[PDB]
Amino acid sequence: SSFEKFEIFPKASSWPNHETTKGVTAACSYSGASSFYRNLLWITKKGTSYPKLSKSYTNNKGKEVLVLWGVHHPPSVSEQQSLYQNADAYVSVGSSKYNRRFAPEIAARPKVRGQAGRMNYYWTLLDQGDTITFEATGNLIAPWYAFALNKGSDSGIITSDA
Amino acid sequence: KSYTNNKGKEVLVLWGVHHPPSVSEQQSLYQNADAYVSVGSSKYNRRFAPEIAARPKVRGQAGRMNYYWTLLDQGDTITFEATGNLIAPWYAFALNKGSDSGIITSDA
């Protein structure tokens, strides 16, 4: 029925070693200028040096938490070299019931919206109690907000124009 | 290592793939930073690779282990071929038929 939007990782505090801003493209354009999503965060390096990152989070809200993230991959080798200084890379998400390593791939492909790279998106429900750990080496889109869900069933989607 | 059957009925075979959460534990248990296992038959064929990642402890354990099963046919063989993480089967089962059974959750 309802949720509460809150912030897991603050943009200023949770990322001391990397670059928070400069995470912006023209394919996601707002008011003529370039922008990005309001719940995620592109992350690049602070000065051509990428520390391997690891960060955890617990919940206490008594309800389930719905967490999103994304995995970018560029289509060319030199773009992966430019953005992250590591030809090999992986990210990894761990919890009690969810556990997956991701690796990027590099391949040539036709442009859509003037972009040749791609980005996959992932979601996981958390339980009360149990934690989650992100642990990344080249391509993490970190969550910047998340949601705490209530109950109250029997709703849905209607496609109409009334 | 290979295995054939002769029992005239289907054989239900299990195994598992371990992975530890840290690099040094994988170094300690198997002396190989890279590893793979592989299971081959006629209709089943899969390579597995381990992964190493940090994750919170459950039951005082931070490693994980996946589990797999495959029905065999009469005749056809199966081969295990491993380099770092095989949980080998130690028993297996030969199944009969006779249908219309199931599971009941009750306390009578």
Binding site: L125 | D100, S101, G102, I103, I104
Partner: protein, 51 residues
Amino acid sequence: VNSVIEKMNTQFTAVGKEFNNLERRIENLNKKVDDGFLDVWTYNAELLVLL
């Protein structure tokens, strides 16, 4: 009475099934199927007796 008995067929084994957290769609379909057949059978039985 013997005709009304012998028209209704007996049902064989039916056991509820299992699903993980990523197959909610098929489970909702399963529940819709079972409740729909249950409503049709109880409607036919009550209407048959009342006529």
